[PDB]
């Protein structure tokens, strides 16, 4: 009797709004441009599935269309905020060691999880054995870098799909977005780009958790009286 | 009960179908969010194929009209001894200052190219700019 | 009257520079490993330059320097490869320090 109203006022209400968390105010094409997000790899490194998201080549250096990035980033942040609102487990994954420390701190600060180290075979597909039969796996995996250190797709991209986990991923011009649920074309190398991403995801995740507490608290106060 | 066939459809289609068949008792936490706010492309595995014969990527080279003026300026005067400051988003190089003057004089009706380039150098010299010809 | 991306790209200093070969740029040292200086100069990738023998101690974290660029990204395609191998760093020559 009281559960249906709970799930309707708290879990189903946010899904009726186009931007329930107002994540579009977090970034702009200019803010992305200042962080050098449009800078891609050379044309010789281009992946063919990234051609839709490329604006062009400036002297053999591919340029990412920030108009598309802005729309893809809006979707990725909106999904990430909704999953944080629902108290989902969000796992950040990246093998770029220049940013391992930065990413691990961003995860701890937002109250989420990071795996920036060597990814051992079967962390997701064999988690019950490695962690225990009652282990809860992540509900959302966010890739700040989709490639490993040998320039191949991170094994977790394939294994996330196997376990039916949605993936958010920054996909540069040499990356493969086929299996990434919410790809965001953008520069993954520049420190300014990666720092920007961490602020946006950290802010989106933190805002959604505070929104979840506000609604719950209001829903309880009104319930008693 | 589930499906690890990551190359058959997408996580949404595989999850949606097994929910209908009763294989999955409960929907995953993310399913309702994906349904309301789906991605632009459904994430379906694809195998990247190599182009052969007359197939070429649609990416086009990015060029601007002023690039012709920049190529000539670098040929005639070389790169300025002044250093680019790519951190300042409003930085203007000697070439960009040359390009802006060249553009202004073209809008004044001048149409010759060799004449529009020599008058531009004089204007900058009058303004105190250093233009050392390479040869 | 919102500026479009095409407008930002046209008027960006990196676009206005043209080719990077033999272009003088100002970089900033952000990381140091022994005598290896990691310098950001506004591009996608940083360059790594060895500490100069003369006035080596003047090069510290945050010190702004003058560079002569060679390539924004070092990449090459090797025989039997479908793509290009990249080292994920730019090629530049360290000239000295920038001072006011």
């Amino acid at each position: 009797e009281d559960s249906t109203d709970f799930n309707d006022k708290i879990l189903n209400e946010p899904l009726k709004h186009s931007d329930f968390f107002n994540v579009k105010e977090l970034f702009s094409v200019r803010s992305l441009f200042d962080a050098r997000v449009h800078l891609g790899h050379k044309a010789g490194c281009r992946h063919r599935f990234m051609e839709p998201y490329i604006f062009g080549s400036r002297l053999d250096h591919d340029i990412i269309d920030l108009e598309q990035t802005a729309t893809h980033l809006q979707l990725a942040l909106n999904f990430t905020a909704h999953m944080a609102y629902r108290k989902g487990i969000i796992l950040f994954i990246s093998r770029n060691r220049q940013f391992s420390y930065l990413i691990e701190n961003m995860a701890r600060d937002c109250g989420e999880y990071a795996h920036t180290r060597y990814f051992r075979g079967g962390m997701l597909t064999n988690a019950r054995l490695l962690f225990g039969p009652t282990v809860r796996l992540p509900d959302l995996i966010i890739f700040l870098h989709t490639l490993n250190n040998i320039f191949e797709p991170h094994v977790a991209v394939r294994d996330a799909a196997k376990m039916n986990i949605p993936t958010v991923g920054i996909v540069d011009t040499n990356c493969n977005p086929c299996l990434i649920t919410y790809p965001v074309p953008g520069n993954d190398d520049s420190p300014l780009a990666v720092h920007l991403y961490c602020r946006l995801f950290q802010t989106a995740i933190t805002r959604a958790k505070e929104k979840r507490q506000q609604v719950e608290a209001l829903y309880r106060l009104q319930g008693q009286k | 009960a589930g499906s690890r066939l990551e190359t058959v459809g997408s996580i949404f289609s595989r999850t949606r179908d097994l929910v209908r068949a009763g294989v999955l008792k409960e929907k995953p936490l993310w399913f309702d969010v994906y349904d309301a706010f789906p991605p632009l492309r459904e994430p379906v595995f694809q195998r990247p194929r190599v182009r052969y014969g007359k197939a070429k990527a649609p990416i086009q080279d990015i060029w601007y009209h002023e690039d012709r003026i920049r190529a000539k300026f670098y040929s005639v005067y070389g790169s300025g001894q002044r250093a680019f400051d790519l951190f300042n988003p409003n930085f203007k190089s000697t070439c960009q200052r040359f390009v802006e003057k060249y553009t202004e004089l073209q809008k004044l009706g001048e149409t010759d190219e060799e004449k529009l380039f020599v008058e531009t150098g004089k204007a900058l010299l009058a303004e105190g700019v250093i233009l050392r010809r390479v040869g | 009257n919102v500026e479009s991306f095409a407008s930002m790209l046209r008027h960006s200093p990196l676009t206005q520079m043209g080719p990077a070969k033999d272009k003088l740029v100002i970089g900033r040292i952000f990381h140091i490993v022994e005598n290896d200086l990691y310098i950001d100069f506004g591009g996608k990738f940083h360059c790594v330059c060895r500490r100069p023998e003369v006035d080596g101690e003047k090069y510290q974290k945050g010190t702004r320097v003058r560079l002569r660029l060679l390539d924004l990204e070092l990449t090459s395609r090797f025989l039997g490869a479908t793509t290009d191998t990249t080292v994920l760093e730019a090629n530049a020559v360290l000239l000295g320090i920038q001072e006011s």
Binding site: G56 | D61, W63, Y64, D67, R68, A71 | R10
Partner: peptide
């Protein structure tokens, strides 16, 4: 449409091809 869009043309910064020491000589 938009004035700031890229325009199609040939590479203006393209460098000439290399030549041997005897290119152009009998």
């Amino acid at each position: 449409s938009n004035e700031d869009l890229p325009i199609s043309m040939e590479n203006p910064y393209k460098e000439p091809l290399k030549k041997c020491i005897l290119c152009g000589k009998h």
